[PDB]
Design a protein around this ligand. Structure first.
Ligand SMILES: C[C@H]1C(=O)[C@]23[C@H](O)[C@H]1CC[C@H]2[C@@]12CO[C@]3(O)[C@@H](O)[C@@H]1C(C)(C)CC[C@@H]2O
Ligand SMILES: C[C@H]1C(=O)[C@]23[C@H](O)[C@H]1CC[C@H]2[C@@]12CO[C@]3(O)[C@@H](O)[C@@H]1C(C)(C)CC[C@@H]2O
Lengths: 301, 301
């Protein structure tokens, strides 16, 4: 029993992390087979980051301009190319610790583990959600850029995030591993701001099922509601609409606890309208939305 | 910027995790050099766990009774001995992935990373604190026993916890790696219960400094207080007394933010007496006590 914000074991990713240096700019790279992936802004100086032209900046660079260190061992770069907002540095040596991996783009509402790194040195691991507004609420200091987000299915590492920048509200923006940004963000330090965020309704419902399975029952009631009447309430409290697929996805958890999805929706309506009254759910005094139905089943089955 | 409950990278520990089977009982072991460490109750059946005599149970066992699998490879056990509540199984092969390590016993109030494992297979990593009552609030299902807690200093793994049992309130009890239990708990499924817990005052203060550094300032005030007058309030709300060493340990954080320790104590007094008023601190609606001064400096420096 018990429920914690749990990250995937980070070992398989730790063995892929390297340092990439161009001039006086250094950040983290991902070394898979004979390619190192890193943010393209590694070729920018402090001045350039205002408004760079990356094609012009890259054409003026050669292989010897890129320093790659795999811990102590320096890797000889034998090729460079730009793919969207990521740089691909072809190197001398194939990473002998290269795991089975895929590059997958995730959806808002889905979770992943972040291995925060500094100068190619792993510092810590934590669980994130992709916010509805395509930002993440991470923990990143200067030199954390190139740090990756990932899930592990069996022995396969699904890489979904590379960290690029911090936004004005202190939230974080990055790309998939093909170098395509999540949300309407660009790799220049300018006047960009996160759009209005919403609460991930299906995740909050999954978390209430986790609470029931772990013996927190106080918020349950005899009432039920309709998907329409619930969605009217959701809109008012800045929650995402719930769909038939959402209730279908919550089916297994519904069956395990014996509480119908629309019954649990009735509980959420009451919690939104009334609050908690000095009471807690799984050691929290607010409604948690960074656990997916899968995350709950994983930890509570 | 940003603040997350961050675990240490788990790679160095992942490579030490094995499965130990005796009869129909299976759990996790820690393989360091040519020794595998596991809970001694692996030699107990469902019936024995009521009231076992481990000396009698072990004397009736031989090396061939212990099945150890390092993933696929089976390890030949060539010796067995009991050290307090842990079993030491001497094996054929020295673990080639054995990191630099120490066995350290931690204090109530200190934090560590847990690598939750099932049948010698790592499942996830999360951060814990040793509660004042020597329990931990972990996430453990059947087959999680033998899972270890640890810190990483430089390249050295300081192992501090091995998981043994779950208590009636759904909290967890275990030993250091010398097999000595944290708190007044024993390895038999009986009527044991956790003593009354308290809030780790110094940790809550460190977390308020983390909030200030990340731009949460609303709870600050012009007031200060004395260490005595604060400790009178602490006692009432079931907080641990604050000592001169606690304020000394908070010195660096005090200097970084320019808020005196006793000024921050005044803020905590108000938060305890008044509450938060629908407001949050670092994405929490209650006062968090599982971040040490070290944990904050680590993430906010
Ligand atoms: C790598 C990311 C990052 O961390 C950036 C951005 O959020 C993003 C891109 C650039 C840095 C940073 C500008 O702002 C940063 O937040 C900051 O950490 C960087 C320094 C320390 C001020 C150095 C200059 C540097 O331009
Ligand atoms: C390994 C720990 C553990 O997980 C124990 C205890 O908390 C502790 C020791 C024993 C098991 C468990 C008795 O209670 C358990 O909570 C439970 O998970 C175990 C089973 C699944 C019921 C099987 C029998 C077994 O006796």
């Amino acid at each position: 029993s018990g429920f914690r914000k749990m990250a995937f074991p980070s070992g398989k990713v730790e063995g892929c992390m390297v340092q990439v240096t161009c001039g006086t700019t250094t950040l983290n790279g991902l070394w898979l087979d004979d390619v190192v992936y890193c943010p393209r802004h590694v070729i920018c100086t402090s001045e350039d980051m205002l408004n760079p032209n990356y094609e012009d900046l890259l054409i003026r660079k050669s292989n010897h301009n890129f320093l790659v260190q795999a811990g102590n061992v320096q890797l000889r770069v034998i090729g460079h190319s730009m793919q969207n907002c990521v740089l691909k540095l072809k190197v001398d040596t194939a990473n002998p610790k290269t795991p089975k991996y895929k590059f997958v783009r995730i959806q808002p509402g889905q979770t992943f583990s972040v291995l925060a790194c500094y100068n190619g040195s792993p510092s810590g691991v934590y669980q994130c959600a992709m916010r509805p507004n395509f930002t993440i609420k991470g923990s990143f200091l200067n030199g954390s850029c190139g740090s990756v987000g990932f899930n592990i299915d069996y022995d396969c590492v699904s890489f979904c995030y590379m960290h690029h920048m911090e936004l004005p509200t202190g939230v974080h923006a990055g790309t998939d591993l093909e170098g395509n940004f999540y949300g309407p963000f660009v790799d220049r330090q300018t006047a960009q701001a996160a759009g209005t965020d919403t609460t991930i309704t299906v995740n909050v419902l999954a978390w209430l099922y986790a609470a029931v399975i772990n013996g927190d029952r106080w918020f349950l009631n005899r009432f039920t509601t309709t998907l329409n009447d619930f969605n009217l309430v959701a809109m008012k409290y800045n929650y995402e609409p719930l769909t038939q697929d959402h209730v279908d996805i919550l089916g297994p958890l519904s069956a395990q606890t014996g509480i119908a999805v629309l019954d649990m929706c009735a509980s959420l309506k009451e919690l939104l309208q009334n609050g908690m009254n000095g009471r807690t759910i799984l050691g929290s005094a607010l409604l948690e939305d960074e656990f997916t139905p899968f995350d709950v089943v994983r930890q509570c089955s």
